[PDB]
Design a protein around this ligand. Structure first.
Ligand SMILES: COc1ccc(Cc2nn3c([C@@H](CCCc4ccccc4)[C@@H](C)O)nc(C)c3c(=O)[nH]2)cc1OC
Ligand SMILES: [Mg+2]
Ligand SMILES: [Zn+2]
Length: 338
């Protein structure tokens, strides 16, 4: 593979050379060509100075990065570009929110690596599908819940344990353990069921105020930051959120079609004959995404622009909802669709 050759021998490019706006909340990482993303991951790790901080072997890191990228499939939304954009948001939080005042370096490093790995081997199907379709993943994990998230973590472990890919193998036995426990907790935090379970604890933390000496506050904050990274497409301009909604519903409806094919009745949001996209997106933005970015703003006043963009995008869904009702004739002037 020549992609590895270049990552290894060309040198780690400075982040500023990628784009003048690369470290800004206005930057859209999906604009970066996919062939430049692995070098961008090295550039971000170097700019956060984790390579020198942790004495990471650059050939091992290059192999690890390429293995993680190869570990993603190509469903419409849950692909490497999603993992890359999530990792890029983690980097933006580091650069704009001064995370070093709240978390340990090892926790921030674990959060970034978790962002890269958090949807490994996603097939475009959700946790409920695994159980309903009686998949091997359900057989392995259904009794413990968070089926896909347990699989994503297991895939990350399998990559670390691949010859020449263990970026942490020189860590002390305490730090190596710490890193795996952090990756496990952070990846499991991407299940909506987990976020709903900890939501009251997040509210309590934001209410009492963050305590850097409280180990449970560090853990809760990492969960909040991970979910803020995972939903970060919603903090970009309208155009980005509109295209990402297209990708998500294409993926969801392909799942619903598989379910109908197996004789199952899919949930309304996975059924292309029932799902009403503006109501579903408004519910997601108002009840799930906005409270996450509002908690982020409560803890970090500099995150106010993120919450304001999510609120602005939520308002835009109300503004264009009327377009889902066909007034007049369709574009082709035909009633053939009837
Ligand atoms: C009312 O409930 C929903 C309404 C709409 C959706 C579709 C959706 N899912 N979504 C997602 C995830 C769901 C994220 C669930 C979550 C997990 C942890 C913390 C918060 C949310 C999908 C693609 O898997 N990311 C984004 C940016 C979106 C997005 O804009 N829309 C999903 C919903 O529930 C899962
Ligand atoms: Mg996921
Ligand atoms: Zn994700």
């Amino acid at each position: 593979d020549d992609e590895y050759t270049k990552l290894l021998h060309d040198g780690i490019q400075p982040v500023a050379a990628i784009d003048s706006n690369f470290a800004s909340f206005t930057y859209t990482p999906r604009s970066l060509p996919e062939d430049d993303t692995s070098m961008a991951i090295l550039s971000m790790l170097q700019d956060m100075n984790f390579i020198n901080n942790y004495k990471i072997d650059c050939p091992t890191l290059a192999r690890f990065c390429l293995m993680v990228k190869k570990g993603y499939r190509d469903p419409p939304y849950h692909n490497w570009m999603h993992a890359f954009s999530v990792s890029h948001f983690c980097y933006l939080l580091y650069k704009n929110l001064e995370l070093t005042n709240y978390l340990e370096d090892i926790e921030i490093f674990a959060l970034f690596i978790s962002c890269m790995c958090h949807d490994l081997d996603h097939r475009g199907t959700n946790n409920s599908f695994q159980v309903a379709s009686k998949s091997v993943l359900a057989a392995l994990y259904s009794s413990e819940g968070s089926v896909m998230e347990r699989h994503h973590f297991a895939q990350a472990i399998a990559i670390l344990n691949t010859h020449g890919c263990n970026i942490f193998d020189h860590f002390s036995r305490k730090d190596y353990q710490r890193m795996l426990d952090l990756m496990r907790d952070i990846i499991l935090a991407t299940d909506l069921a987990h976020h709903l379970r900890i939501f009251k604890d997040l509210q309590k933390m934001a209410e009492v105020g963050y305590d850097r000496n409280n180990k449970q506050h560090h853990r809760l904050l990492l969960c909040l930051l991970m979910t803020s990274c995972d939903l970060s497409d919603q903090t970009k301009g309208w155009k980005t959120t509109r295209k990402i909604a297209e990708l998500i519903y294409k993926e969801f409806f392909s799942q619903g079609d598989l379910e109908k094919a197996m004789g199952n009745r899919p949930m309304e949001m996975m059924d292309r004959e029932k799902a009403y996209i503006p109501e579903l997106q408004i519910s997601f933005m108002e009840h799930i995404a906005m409270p996450i970015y509002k908690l982020l703003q409560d803890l970090f006043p500099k995150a106010a622009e993120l919450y304001e963009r999510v609120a602005s995008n939520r308002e835009h869904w109300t503004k264009v909802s009327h377009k889902f009702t066909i007034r007049g004739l369709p574009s082709n002037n035909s009633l053939d669709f009837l």
